Amino acid sequence: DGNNPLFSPYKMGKFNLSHRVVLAPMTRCRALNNIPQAALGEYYEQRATAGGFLITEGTMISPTSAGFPHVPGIFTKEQVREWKKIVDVVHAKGAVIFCQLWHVGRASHEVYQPAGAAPISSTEKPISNRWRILMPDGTHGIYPKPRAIGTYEISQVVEDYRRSALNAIEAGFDGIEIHGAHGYLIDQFLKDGINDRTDEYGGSLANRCKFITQVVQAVVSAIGADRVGVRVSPAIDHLDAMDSNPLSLGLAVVERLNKIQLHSGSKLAYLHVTQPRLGSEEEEARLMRTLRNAYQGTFICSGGYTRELGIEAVAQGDADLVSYGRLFISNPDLVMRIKLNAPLNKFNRKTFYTQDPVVGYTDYPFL
Numbered sequence: 001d002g003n004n005p006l007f008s009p010y011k012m013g014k015f016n017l018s019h020r021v022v023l024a025p026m027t028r029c030r031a032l033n034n035i036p037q038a039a040l041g042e043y044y045e046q047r048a049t050a051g052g053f054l055i056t057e058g059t060m061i062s063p064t065s066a067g068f069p070h071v072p073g074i075f076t077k078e079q080v081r082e083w084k085k086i087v088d089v090v091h092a093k094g095a096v097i098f099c100q101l102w103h104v105g106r107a108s109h110e111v112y113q114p115a116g117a118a119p120i121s122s123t124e125k126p127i128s129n130r131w132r133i134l135m136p137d138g139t140h141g142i143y144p145k146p147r148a149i150g151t152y153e154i155s156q157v158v159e160d161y162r163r164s165a166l167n168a169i170e171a172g173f174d175g176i177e178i179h180g181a182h183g184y185l186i187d188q189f190l191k192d193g194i195n196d197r198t199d200e201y202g203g204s205l206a207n208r209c210k211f212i213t214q215v216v217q218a219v220v221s222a223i224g225a226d227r228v229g230v231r232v233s234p235a236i237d238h239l240d241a242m243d244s245n246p247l248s249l250g251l252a253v254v255e256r257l258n259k260i261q262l263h264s265g266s267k268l269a270y271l272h273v274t275q276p277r278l279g280s281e282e283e284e285a286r287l288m289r290t291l292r293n294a295y296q297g298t299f300i301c302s303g304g305y306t307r308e309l310g311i312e313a314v315a316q317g318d319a320d321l322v323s324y325g326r327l328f329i330s331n332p333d334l335v336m337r338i339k340l341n342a343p344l345n346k347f348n349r350k351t352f353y354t355q356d357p358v359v360g361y362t363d364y365p366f367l
């Protein structure tokens, strides 16, 4: 229970992991002009451990997929070449690493789009004015009205995902994770609070799950199920990503994932789910455990976890792996700290998305 189950081995498909503390995917904006920089190598290397699993910050699948400044991409030859040197560094420490493929959909701005074109989405509805977009100059801005894409374009975006997954393997990544969370493109199709479509991609749960299903199937077909992770967050309302029945949505997605696994004859690397964060906590805990019990595979829980909460989830069978975000920003050796129950360093939100290669990036101290 407390003899630390976070340090009992785990087999995530073909990757034998030595412990269960996972580096959660986090955008840090140091990949200037969408090219992975040496700084990324330094950052990931510091956090890498023998038999530890790291998931990269969101990575672009096309010229139209970004919504933050200086986020890396993996759709060009130049980017793959640069990602490679970073993957080699991490592999030299004996870690397993997945690249997260991210498309922001409507959560963008003309400044992030080629020729200042409008961002794409399942809908023409813009994120509300209650949310603001971080701008290249550090200020914020307004999310514009997106362009609702048709089905032919939906299939092209799917191909963008498939080619990116192939580029990730080319770079040496052990696998990829599909970012189908936090109100981004995929969540814009999943969430009935956003998806107001009248075609075969909207309305019913089946139609709203069509886009994520086709995305996962394409990448599974291209690199193997065992090298694909899927991340979603039905109960997180970020960027107006709300649904009338969070749990029903979550279970419909798991159902499609179990079906993709059955038809392929292989299991996905995992299902990674982000929790919101008492009557509210218990409820979210019930939701998490139910999507876990429903998924025939490895489950990674994330969102507000501490050493204590991570230990508990694994001990109680609520998850097989626990991903850490913010605490991993400020504790390069978070795994070692959790192991020794050594004190943790605070993190500085101010430098989460700044562009300096070191300041608030790789200069947080080790124990």
Ligand SMILES: Cc1cc2nc3c(=O)[nH]c(=O)nc-3n(C[C@H](O)[C@H](O)[C@H](O)COP(=O)(O)O)c2cc1C
Binding pocket: 024, 025, 026, 027, 028, 057, 058, 100, 102, 179, 181, 182, 231, 274, 302, 303, 304, 305, 323, 324, 325, 326, 327, 352, 353
């Ligand atoms: C600075 C920052 C950047 C993030 N970038 C991403 C991202 O690119 N993709 C994603 O799926 N989640 C992203 N997240 C959400 C985290 O992966 C994770 O779910 C969250 O940090 C978990 O809670 P914790 O911070 O208490 O560990 C980000 C979070 C932070 C704080």
